[PDB]
Design a binder for this molecule. Structure first.
Ligand SMILES: Nc1nc2c(c(=O)[nH]1)N[C@H]1C(S)=C(S)[C@@H](COP(=O)(O)OP(=O)(O)OC[C@H]3O[C@@H](n4cnc5c(=O)[nH]c(N)nc54)[C@H](O)[C@@H]3O)O[C@H]1N2
Ligand SMILES: Nc1nc2c(c(=O)[nH]1)N[C@H]1C(S)=C(S)[C@@H](COP(=O)(O)OP(=O)(O)OC[C@H]3O[C@@H](n4cnc5c(=O)[nH]c(N)nc54)[C@H](O)[C@@H]3O)O[C@H]1N2
Ligand SMILES: Cc1cc2nc3c(=O)[nH]c(=O)nc-3n(C[C@H](O)[C@H](O)[C@H](O)COP(=O)(O)O)c2cc1C
Ligand code: SF4
Ligand code: SF4
Ligand code: SF4
Ligand code: SF4
Ligand code: FES
Ligand code: FES
Ligand SMILES: [W+6]
Lengths: 790, 541
């Protein structure tokens, strides 16, 4: 703490706090244009709007960038400082276009100018650069530019997209993108970080401007929710103009640092699609359920007909009831969606377990990362990531094997780039094809496709034969370290180099760097998992992390990147046909009795069929009748005579999609669903954080909430469910999920998010798990070797 | 979404692959690779920037932002015109302006200008005494006229002409690094060198006046592997002293440089002379390679316009291979240098005189001095003087004495009306104030300073307000454009003075803002001419 003097009164400054921050805390804020008081933006003192007078100095100081030191005396209300700030604003205003038909006439710059009473300027204006509107989603008009440099920080420091710079000298210095191109053909990824970093209207969304580039629309309402595209849980603030989402801004979520990608800034227009189901549909008897028929989305009445919410709903809940009561309880199954809330996923699986009386619950999104979760459960008795992707800021070595986060988890990739560019982090891209992250990579081990187990085994052999492993960690926290030691000898870099694509010395260097690093995180995605026999890929990764000891401490862990809204929370809700909610085995008698007593009904003992099992059983006729919610199996797996033909053979198909999707072509009853924008609930991200979503708009037409439809179907199935909303469902499922033990709806509303392995109501949760052992019955993990048997 | 961008052409990749050869592809050499491309090809094609960024693992934005800051790199995109082979530059500055530079610029811009030659203005080339100065493809023409420039262009006399200078063997025949050899061996302690340097009182001759001994001691105190850089930017319009010493006695400067490096333990040193000095570059390249091996490895780096790169933080950033934007000064450059490592930067002038202090004593340095001031200074005098050139004279020398004792008078047909001490950075003064001693700490009370001892004499045949306008335009073009007071204030002041009568009050307010809220010294002095001409020439408004 620094006990310096500000504006005549003694104050205290926290470590790392600038004079501007202290002044803001005390309430005596001062104008700022280049300074953006948001996380991730390094204070650059190049606007000189924040000038203050500090005794002993010959000139004024930018409290923007200057920190108070013991004994410092600061004065900001003096004539010198006020005049300097006013002259800065006056010069910039002399450069400004206008404040009536200008770009964002209520921008930060104009607010600061109003603070200093700088309405007009005495200095002549200068001709500037022409407006640029090449990029569809966002328009740059540099004639308002202040050269405050915030956009370059946003593109090159916060997102590290490196598509902006001030290339010219003097007043000619302008904002460029790459070789001063109009952006509409540059390397811009449209994340909008610069647009959200501009203190003027020089960078604005193209939806807020008109042909004349003057601000037109001021969103009346803005609602904060999440982004239903990535599993990174990227919080958003949607802007509503006349009951429509027109723009999206990122908020200070715990997974995103006020930053979004293109899919978070824009792409919200899917909610307001003209071809969005509004009324329930029933397949008219005349039209046969053809195998290859294609329903026209623009004309949904060629195969279906209008009907009220009680006729279609009754038909849907009656077909399934008749099927269960005639063919048998084992003739039904349901496909939940990893796009809906955790309360929908829990409610859906509970319906499929109670009304249908089986365990045929499976969401198609789990096929990807199926092998990775299988291996992680086999070795660690847990499938969740061990560390957040924000842990990269503490890791010395980063591994991104088999993932492309720059395209699929852009904010996580941005955090990786920040780790590289701000810390001494060495990321290794272990991908067969070159990646945008490769330019920031210490090494890129491009290897022949499918030759991944070979090279990870080679790294393991290096670590073992070189004694790099720490015997202390193995002896006390793991089992089976001797089994591999017998077979790891065969796989060596000299031999595995030929089959792999990396030379032996490169493998040795990578293995040594990974082993000796104080902290080392691993990131992987579908590249290793979806690959046939992806359990071995994951198994050797767990072995690397485990023998090396790189787990359970900050900056260390295993983090498979979940590429879907809440697949993690969908699995935690019990959408798996082999386990109850919270990964409680369906075969254990105690677990069965616990749910049997809690749910008040006999539960199926034998484990349910998997999604592929259900699909192939439809062909045999063992299963007839389905209920698909928020999934499109009709166009998910190879669909010629295995998935599309399978759906057409169903005796009764119920679908609950937002659009008349392909899977809804064969649906006898179509249930118009509400989108993520017009729903509430809770979602869990790849980081293991539970976040609450809020409705921003209303469902088109009389489209209803998904949980409402599920509850209505349950009621028509004799279950007698009475839930007043997502909150009641969340409470009910938290009464049974050990994962959601000390977290409640009231606490989740506040604080935005809660990493669910938490200990106390005020505690921030456990971002790093497995710090003091493993959940395995023995309390220690297993080291399972990988078998190569082509 | 449009993240495609611009695809690096395969043809541009192989050309930069062969061009770079085995040179280090680190960002610290970005400026040098830009020089290589600009020299091998008269321009830096956009595809060449893309190839260089690919080879150096950089972003297109980074290389373009770096290469468009210097005024001697010609970025040319697919739509821009091809730069002609020969580029002749006409200095448009206070002295060359006195000697018909602008008229000459117009003259050869319409007579010998063509598609094979480009005529452009230049800030200054340190050839003021031989005004007007014109450069023809690295060949600078003294007192250039239409006929001389035409003969140079048509004869292809473009390359620089190397003079006769004391070579390495000639320097060995006399001094011959004996003082340095007595330092690299434990014969005279480093403490004695610093003691004599401090007692003599030698001060930085780049335009700051900071004692050299204090800098050396302070940098020596800083821990870690230290570094050292040499400031050969010397971009002040009225300054040419440094080029004289480079092109006459390079090894005295090199001895001083090596002594400073040894005193600091800097494993290596960097030289940052201009690109407007082909002569000095060739001289140093020749003689840098004749010194004995071992000791401290010495690097010769080259500039590209960017008068701001003479500022120590700007020079550091330019050596780092990035834009020469100065740095804020909570951390001083001697604590956090170019690679975050402590480094001292000294002008080639101050490195030239350390040897004499060590070998000839501090009393010798303190024996000279005209007025109460002490020391010995090299004055760069140009303009309306009978004999213009570098004057090695004592300190505290009033301009009247400097004119009628070293310049041989004023001129035939001219009268002494006004003068500017220190160059464009300092302000213009009336000839009626000729009784002001010239030294580091005797000119501030008048709002002026003598940085590089650049002195330009104004007569009654030249207008002081036109001189102020020229200086303002020079500052407006040379500001790096980082902060607001300089970037915008220079432009606004220039605009205010294109009028018939300018607003004295508005100009004073803008000057106060520029002087109080500017980041570096370029903007803190850019308004000096304006305020000085307003204050000391009341009868001109
Ligand atoms: N923005 C965006 N986000 C998405 C999606 C999208 O299309 N766009 N789709 C979603 C999809 S369905 C899933 S859930 C995830 C996808 O998550 P990802 O990890 O991105 O899956 P892929 O993009 O198919 O491949 C990832 C990387 O694996 C590398 N690779 C290819 N073959 C191999 C191999 O044999 N071995 C190894 N080790 N690596 C290999 C590939 O070169 C590729 O760079 O993201 C989801 N989220
Ligand atoms: N051709 C093709 N096939 C694939 C893939 C692919 O990228 N292309 N991906 C493969 C693997 S990696 C994965 S990505 C999957 C594909 O991933 P899928 O999830 O199967 O396909 P999506 O269309 O993204 O899933 C969203 C569906 O649910 C609906 N929906 C969206 N939001 C909501 C909501 O809030 N509520 C409700 N009730 N419904 C909603 C949409 O209308 C759509 O029907 O299958 C695989 N098969
Ligand atoms: C805008 C600006 C430009 C400068 N250019 C030079 C220069 O070209 N050469 C020089 O020796 N000093 C120049 N200086 C003076 C600096 O102090 C110089 O970079 C360095 O301090 C020289 O150190 P020295 O005086 O100990 O030799 C410049 C200063 C400023 C503010
Ligand atoms: S939108 Fe994102 S990628 Fe595009 S210029 Fe702005 S910060 Fe850079
Ligand atoms: S475009 Fe906006 S953020 Fe970027 S420099 Fe100009 S005013 Fe600042
Ligand atoms: S990174 Fe993922 S969650 Fe964040 S805005 Fe982009 S798509 Fe949405
Ligand atoms: S005063 Fe001028 S040269 Fe110095 S940092 Fe500011 S804009 Fe750049
Ligand atoms: S407040 Fe310091 S530049 Fe913005
Ligand atoms: S060379 Fe023209 S003013 Fe210096
Ligand atoms: W998927």
């Amino acid at each position: 703490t620094i006990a310096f003097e500000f504006d005549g009164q003694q104050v205290e400054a926290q470590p790392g706090e600038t004079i501007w921050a202290v002044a803001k805390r005390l309430g005596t804020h001062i104008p700022h244009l280049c300074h953006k008081p948001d996380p991730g933006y390094r204070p650059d003192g190049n606007c000189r709007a924040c000038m203050v007078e500090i005794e002993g100095e010959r000139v004024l100081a930018a409290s923007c960038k200057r920190t108070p030191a013991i004994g410092m005396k600061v004065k900001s209300a003096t004539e010198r400082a006020t005049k300097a700030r006013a002259m800065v604003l006056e010069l910039l205003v002399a450069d400004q276009p206008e404040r009536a038909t200008s770009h964002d006439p209520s921008s930060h710059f104009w607010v600061q100018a109003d603070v200093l009473d700088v309405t007009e300027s005495r200095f002549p204006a200068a001709e500037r650069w022409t407006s640029d509107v090449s990029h569809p989603a966002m328009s740059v008009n540099l004639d308002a530019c202040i050269q405050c440099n915030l956009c370059v920080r946003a593109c090159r420091e916060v997102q590290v997209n490196d598509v902006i710079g001030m290339a010219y000298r003097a007043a000619g210095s302008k904002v460029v993108f790459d070789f001063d191109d109009p952006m509409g053909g540059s390397t811009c990824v449209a994340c909008g970080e610069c647009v959200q970093a501009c203190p003027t209207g020089a960078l604005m969304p193209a939806a807020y401007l008109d042909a004349n580039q003057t601000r037109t629309v001021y969103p009346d309402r803005e609602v904060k929710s999440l982004c239903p595209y990535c599993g990174v849980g990227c919080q958003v603030s949607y802007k509503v103009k006349d009951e429509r989402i027109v723009y999206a801004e990122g908020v200070n979520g715990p997974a995103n640092q006020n930053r979004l990608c293109v899919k978070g800034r824009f792409g919200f227009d899917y909610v307001h699609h003209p071809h969005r189901l509004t009324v329930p549909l029933i397949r008219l008897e005349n039209v046969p359920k053809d195998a290859n028929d294609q329903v026209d989305p623009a004309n949904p009445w060629t195969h279906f007909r209008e009907a009220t919410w009680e006729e279609a709903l009754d038909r849907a809940a009656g077909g399934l009831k008749a099927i269960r009561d005639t063919n048998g309880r084992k003739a039904l199954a349901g496909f939940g969606s990893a796009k809906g809330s955790n309360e929908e996923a829990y409610l859906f699986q509970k319906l499929v377990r109670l009304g249908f009386g089986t365990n045929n619950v499976d969401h198609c999104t789990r096929l990807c990362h199926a092998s990775s979760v299988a291996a992680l459960m086999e070795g660690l008795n847990s499938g969740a990531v061990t560390a957040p992707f924000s842990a990269a800021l503490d890791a010395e070595v980063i591994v991104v094997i088999g993932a492309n986060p720059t395209v699929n988890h852009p904010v996580a990739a941005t955090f990786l780039k920040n780790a590289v560019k701000q810390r001494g982090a060495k990321l290794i891209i272990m991908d067969p094809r070159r990646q945008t992250l490769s330019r920031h990579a210490y090494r890129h081990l491009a290897f022949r496709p499918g030759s991944d187990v070979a090279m990870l085994n080679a790294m393991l052999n290096v670590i073992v034969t070189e004694g790099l492993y720490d015997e202390q960690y193995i002896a006390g926290y793991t089992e089976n370290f001797e089994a591999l030691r017998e077979k790891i000898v065969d796989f060596t870099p000299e031999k595995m180099a030929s089959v792999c694509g990396i030379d032996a010395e490169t493998l040795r260097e990578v293995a040594r760097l990974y082993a000796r690093a104080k902290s080392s995180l691993i990131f992987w995605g579908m590249g290793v998992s979806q690959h046939v026999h992806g359990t071995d890929n994951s198994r050797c990764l767990i072995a690397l992390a485990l023998i090396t000891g790189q787990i359970g401490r900050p900056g260390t862990g295993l983090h498979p990147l979940r590429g879907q809204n809440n697949v993690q929370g969908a699995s935690d809700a019990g959408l798996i046909p082999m386990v109850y909610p919270d990964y409680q085995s369906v075969e254990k008698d105690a677990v069965r009795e616990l749910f049997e007593e809690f749910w008040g009904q006999s539960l199926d003992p034998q484990k349910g069929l998997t999604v592929v099992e259900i699909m192939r059983a439809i062909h045999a006729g063992e299963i007839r009748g389905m209920f698909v919610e928020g999934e499109n199996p009709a166009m998910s797996d190879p669909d010629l005579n295995h998935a599309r033909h399978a759906l057409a053979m169903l005796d009764h198909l119920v679908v609950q999609d937002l659009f008349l999707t392909e899977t809804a072509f064969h649906a006898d009853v179509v249930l118009p669903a509400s989108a993520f924008a017009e729903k509430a609930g809770t979602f869990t991200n790849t980081d293991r954080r539970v976040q609450i979503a809020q409705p921003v708009v209303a469902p088109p037409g009389d489209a209803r909430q998904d949980w409402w439809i599920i509850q209505e179907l349950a009621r028509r199935l004799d279950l007698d469910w009475n839930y007043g909303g997502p909150a009641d469902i969340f409470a009910e499922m938290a009464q049974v999920m050990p994962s959601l033990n000390n977290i409640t709806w009231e606490r989740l509303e506040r604080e935005g998010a809660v990493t669910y392995p938490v200990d106390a109501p005020d505690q921030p949760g456990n971002e790093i798990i497995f710090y003091a052992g493993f959940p395995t019955e023995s309390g220690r993990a297993k080291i399972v070797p990988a078998a190569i048997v082509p | 979404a449009v993240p495609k961008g611009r695809q690096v052409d395969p043809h541009a990749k192989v050309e930069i692959e062969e061009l770079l050869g085995t040179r280090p592809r680190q960002r610290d050499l970005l400026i040098e690779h830009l020089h290589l491309i600009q020299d091998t090809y008269g321009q830096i094609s956009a595809d060449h920037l893309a190839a260089l960024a690919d080879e150096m693992s950089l972003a297109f934005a980074e290389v373009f932002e770096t290469a468009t800051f210097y005024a001697h790199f010609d970025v040319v995109k697919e739509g821009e015109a091809d730069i002609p082979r020969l580029t002749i530059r006409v200095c448009d500055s206070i002295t060359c302006a006195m000697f018909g530079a602008d008229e000459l610029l117009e003259t050869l811009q319409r007579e010998l200008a063509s598609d094979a030659v480009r005529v452009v203005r230049a800030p200054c080339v340190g050839l003021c005494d031989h005004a007007p100065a014109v450069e023809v493809g690295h060949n600078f023409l003294h007192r250039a006229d239409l006929a001389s420039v035409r003969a140079a262009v048509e004869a292809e006399d473009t390359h620089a002409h190397i003079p006769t200078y004391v070579d390495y063997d000639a320097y060995r025949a006399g001094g011959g690094y004996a003082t340095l050899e007595r330092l690299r061996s434990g014969e005279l302690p480093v403490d004695d060198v610093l003691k004599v340097l401090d007692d003599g009182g030698l001060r930085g001759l780049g335009g700051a006046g900071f004692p050299t001994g204090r800098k050396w001691r302070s940098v020596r105190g800083e821990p870690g592997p230290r570094l050292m850089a040499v400031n050969g930017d010397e971009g002040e319009p009225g300054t040419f002293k440094d080029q004289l010493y480079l092109n006459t006695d390079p090894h005295r400067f090199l001895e001083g440089m090596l002594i400073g490096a040894h005193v600091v333990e800097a494993a290596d040193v960097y030289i940052y002379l201009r690109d407007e000095y082909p002569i000095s570059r060739e001289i140093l390249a020749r003689e840098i390679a004749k010194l004995p091996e071992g000791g401290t490895r010495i690097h010769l780096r080259r500039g590209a316009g960017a008068y701001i790169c003479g500022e120590e933080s700007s020079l550091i950033e330019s050596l780092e291979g990035k834009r020469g934007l100065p740095r804020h000064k909570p951390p001083f450059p001697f604590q956090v240098g170019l690679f975050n490592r402590p480094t001292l930067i000294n002008n080639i002038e101050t490195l030239f005189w350390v040897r004499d202090l060590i070998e000839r004593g501090a009393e010798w340095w303190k024996s000279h001095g005209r007025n109460g001031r002490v020391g010995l200074r090299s004055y760069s005098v140009s303009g309306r003087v009978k004999e213009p050139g570098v004057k090695l004279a004592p300190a505290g020398l009033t301009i009247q004495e400097l004119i009628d004792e070293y310049c041989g008078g004023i001129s035939d047909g001219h009268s002494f009306a006004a003068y500017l001490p220190g160059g464009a950075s300092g302000g213009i003064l009336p000839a009626s104030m000729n009784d002001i001693p010239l030294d580091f700490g005797t000119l501030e009370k008048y709002g002026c300073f003598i940085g590089s001892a650049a002195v330009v004499i104004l007569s009654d045949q030249d207008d002081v307000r036109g001189a102020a306008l020229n200086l303002m335009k020079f500052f407006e073009d040379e500001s790096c454009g980082q902060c607001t007071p300089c970037r915008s204030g220079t432009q606004k002041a220039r605009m205010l003075m294109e009028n018939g009568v300018w607003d004295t009050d508005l100009l004073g307010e803008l000057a106060q803002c520029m002087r109080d809220a500017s980041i570096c010294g370029l903007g803190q002095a850019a308004s000096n001419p304006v305020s000085t001409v307003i204050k000391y020439f009341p009868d001109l408004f």
